[PDB]
């Protein structure tokens, strides 16, 4: 009455209930890491706040915050350092809004073969929301970025339990940070950020994996060198090649920081072994990428021997989940259903899964066996 089992080895997880949240898949308690049940993704294109997944690295998360006393510090290679209240952010800067997917680097890690260490997630470490806030570009322009600036670092209120453990700090290039899309979000789906989603303020980095989306964000530093903190230099590294992949069991020869999303798609209204009525079977699901636009979603009912073009729903924005619908004729019997998306720059999904040591960036064509009767 309070557990589920994810469809990979050692997949049992408690269903756990946190304040402001519906029951979610408990991965770890300290710090809290929570996965979204896959059924949620069939409930609508925008993931509700009460269902949105939660990931943290360090046990020392804030559990008391006075929104009035909170300040965002802007410092380093700027003309004028700033100390900004939430009221300053809401009043002194124009607001922007973006519907955007947040997805963990290791979303789907549990499906990687051979299995690799780390967060053993199914596909529920992703979610889509309407974020509202201040473009970072606007705040940095106010501070006055100096020539020679190379990167911006981002740090939050959370901290290591033991001071020698590397604090959670991430970095973006200056040109990225000032692009106008990178946002200082104070609102999620029209409400103050849920606590575990980074109340009162978080970075939103549309089209980039979630490690960059620093939560409880209070410290922004412009720097004139490449940041060499542990969580950029050592963690979150991908093979420096087109597939971001290596031969199973092999370490990459060169790496770079993880970056933009690859193309993904899911069928949401059916799961393994679902029953459907033989004849015209309606399928629906979602697709997303790093922001280039989903060009098409193709659907197969014969394990990829042939494809039917799905109709794409009206969009909510290039960074959002894109809905799609298809009606396929299914003969009586077993069918292996697949969907495969491509974007406007020709990125697509591989038919066979690739591998990397950290189990980041999985985007294989998803297969789902259904029974038509």
């Amino acid at each position: 009455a309070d557990t589920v089992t994810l469809p990979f080895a050692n997949g049992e997880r408690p269903l756990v209930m946190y304040p402001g949240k519906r029951p979610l898949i408990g991965l770890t308690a300290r710090p809290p890491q929570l996965e979204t049940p896959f059924s949620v993704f069939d409930e609508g294109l925008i993931t509700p706040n009460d269902a949105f997944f939660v990931m943290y690295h360090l046990a020392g998360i804030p559990l008391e915050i006075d929104p009035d006393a909170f300040r965002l510090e802007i410092k380093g290679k700027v003309g004028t350092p700033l100390s900004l209240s939430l009221q300053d952010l809401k009043n002194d800067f124009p607001a922007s809004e973006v519907v955007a997917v947040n997805q963990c680097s290791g979303n789907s890690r549990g499906f990687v073969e051979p299995r690799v260490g780390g967060g053993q997630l199914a596909n529920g470490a992703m979610g889509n929301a309407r974020w509202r806030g201040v473009p970072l570009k606007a705040v940095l322009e106010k501070a006055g970025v100096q020539a020679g600036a190379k990167q911006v670092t981002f740090g939050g209120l959370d901290g290591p339990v033991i001071p020698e453990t590397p604090d959670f700090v991430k970095a973006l290039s200056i040109d990225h940070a000032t692009d106008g899309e990178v946002m200082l979000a104070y609102s999620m789906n029209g409400a103050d950020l849920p606590w575990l989603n980074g109340y009162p303020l978080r970075l939103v980095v549309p089209g980039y994996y979630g490690t960059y989306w620093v939560k409880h964000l209070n410290e922004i530093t412009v720097i004139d060198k490449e940041f060499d903190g542990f969580w950029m230099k050592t963690a979150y590294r991908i093979p420096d090649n087109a597939c971001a992949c290596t031969e199973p069991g092999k370490a990459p020869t060169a790496t770079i920081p993880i970056n933009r999303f690859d193309v993904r798609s899911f069928i949401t209204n059916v799961e393994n072994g679902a029953s459907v009525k033989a004849g015209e079977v309606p399928l629906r699901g979602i697709a997303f990428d790093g922001g280039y636009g989903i060009t098409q979603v193709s659907v197969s009912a014969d394990a990829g021997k042939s494809w039917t073009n799905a109709t794409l729903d009206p969009g909510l924005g290039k960074y959002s989940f894109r809905g799609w619908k298809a009606v396929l004729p299914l003969t009586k019997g077993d069918h292996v259903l697949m969907c495969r998306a491509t974007n406007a720059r020709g990125e697509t999904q591989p038919m066979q899964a690739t591998w990397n040591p950290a189990g980041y960036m999985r985007n294989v064509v998803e297969a789902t066996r259904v029974i038509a009767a």
Partner: protein, 81 residues
């Protein structure tokens, strides 16, 4: 007043075993995070995987664990998980 957030009680526990590493793991592996991090790893990964997990905690994250306890813990994990 500030706003506050209440976490539910932690209940995660390690799998008991007669190996001395069980108690050493109890005493050393819950100080920074809950032991569900261990409980949820891929099963039957074996000796080299758990040796590496334990060494990472000590060398990368600075877990205050001595050499003898490190072997005991890694051996207990490799046998149990």
């Amino acid at each position: 007043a500030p706003l506050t957030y209440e976490l539910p009680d932690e209940t995660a526990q390690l799998k008991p075993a007669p190996q001395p590493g069980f108690e050493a793991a109890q005493n050393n592996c819950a100080a920074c995070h809950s032991v569900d991090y261990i409980n949820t790893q891929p099963p039957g990964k074996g000796q080299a995987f758990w040796d590496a997990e334990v060494q990472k905690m000590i060398k990368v994250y600075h877990a205050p664990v001595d050499e003898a306890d490190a072997k005991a813990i890694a051996d207990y994990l490799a046998k149990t998980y």
